Subunit: 121 residues, 4 copies
Amino acid sequence: AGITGTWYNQLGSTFIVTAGADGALTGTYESAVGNAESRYVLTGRYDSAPATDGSGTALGWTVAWKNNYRNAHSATTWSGQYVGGAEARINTQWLLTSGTTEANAWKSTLVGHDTFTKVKP
Amino acid sequence: AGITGTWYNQLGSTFIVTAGADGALTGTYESAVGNAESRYVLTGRYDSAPATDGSGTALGWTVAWKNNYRNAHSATTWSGQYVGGAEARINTQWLLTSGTTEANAWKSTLVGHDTFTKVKP
Amino acid sequence: AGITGTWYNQLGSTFIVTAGADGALTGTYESAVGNAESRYVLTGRYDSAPATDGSGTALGWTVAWKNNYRNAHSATTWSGQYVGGAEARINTQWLLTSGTTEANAWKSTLVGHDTFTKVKP
Amino acid sequence: AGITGTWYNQLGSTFIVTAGADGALTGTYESAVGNAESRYVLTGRYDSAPATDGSGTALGWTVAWKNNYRNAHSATTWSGQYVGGAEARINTQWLLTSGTTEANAWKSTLVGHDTFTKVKP
Ligand SMILES: O=c1[nH]ccc2oc(-c3cccc(C(F)(F)F)c3)cc12
Ligand SMILES: O=c1[nH]ccc2oc(-c3cccc(C(F)(F)F)c3)cc12
Ligand SMILES: O=c1[nH]ccc2oc(-c3cccc(C(F)(F)F)c3)cc12
Ligand SMILES: O=c1[nH]ccc2oc(-c3cccc(C(F)(F)F)c3)cc12
């Protein structure tokens, strides 16, 4: 609430989240454009009693890249903070782990960053 | 199932998780001391239909470090895979974001790696 | 140059680097944040024969945060790629490890992302 | 400093390094079977005046995966600390960036961890 609603990253993904009063994040992450085949469940957690000192609100969530259509055998977690105000943002770093054999585990995890805005690009 | 159970990391943290038929992860994360003040909710997702080629099962979860007793204004995400068989393990890397001001955002996020076993370390 | 030149990140740190014919990076780094004063030595490596397919040029470098003035007992590595163009950029992610006791090792390493251009924000 | 010499990671790689009086790390990194084709230049930095409170020694280094024989168009940086004493260790986290097109940049960077010892695994 501040967090609840629709967010857009800088690469074409959208998600919709509900931030519950108990610290829950629940919603849907859509990897592209608009199609059902590109929508996935997301769940996570956030600090439901953040500071009001100019600090962001810590949070994180997961998407496992399986839906009824597709399965990439991988999951992303985003860890970051919500920054409110007129130009609100969710600033994140993420980890994308694929299921691998033990021989390939060294190359199982990508890292990157995403910034989400409320304003549809 | 494989995933469902009680896991421990190398620093004794206790991760009590249930893997639901839908890809859901739910449970609690706590200290080796086992006190209520050290116990926090988690939620996450896993690949409920992993590959059949020997690969692990991708998964992730989040803990926001607030409970009824304490608030660190912080959240951790773990991204990793479950590896089944002879001795089951969950290998992860994690991101811990604390709320910061914008000027301090460059130092908001720690990274590390945790390995979980069904035995204590 | 290409890579050789004076670059600035989104915080205004100054990265003065020379790319040698032998694949070496050498130069100085001056930070806009943290326990840092004046310049610090850097060294690194870059791909001196990048792909010709439109991909960027992979590179990395290290700064240990000790100079003749101050010592923060820590080191940052930046891993990334140079992207040529009308506004050339070096896009990185970085790891900042501090020397810690073993008890504190779990919190030894910060992660982030820096973007460098030849223009100071 | 305790750093100069040959180090081995968990997975078959060998680190030969000299820690100079100027805070420089210089050497080679071999992925190998043990052969010249598997050997790559490394350079980095370390804290040459670490804390005396029992903390480790911060360091980092880079290898670009090009030698006279091959070129993976990628570079790894290791960020970590040397822990001395009876069973000395270099504990690291690493970032491997490949040169990519901008469309592929989200999948440019792998993350992981390596532990180096004085004796072979
Ligand atoms: O918007 C994002 N931000 C950070 C990471 C990330 O990964 C994806 C993504 C979406 C669909 C499939 C897959 C893969 F790789 F096949 F598993 C990954 C989207 C996205
Ligand atoms: O088992 C772990 N593995 C990775 C990260 C991590 O953080 C904690 C932890 C627990 C309580 C509070 C806090 C803090 F920092 F104040 F936010 C962190 C446990 C744990
Ligand atoms: O420009 C940057 N980009 C990414 C990381 C980073 O760290 C520093 C930095 C500079 C001086 C001291 C320290 C600390 F924390 F005390 F060790 C860190 C600058 C900088
Ligand atoms: O020992 C290690 N520890 C962490 C990372 C890492 O990457 C390599 C490595 C070696 C040769 C080629 C390549 C690639 F992928 F083609 F660029 C990577 C070795 C190594």
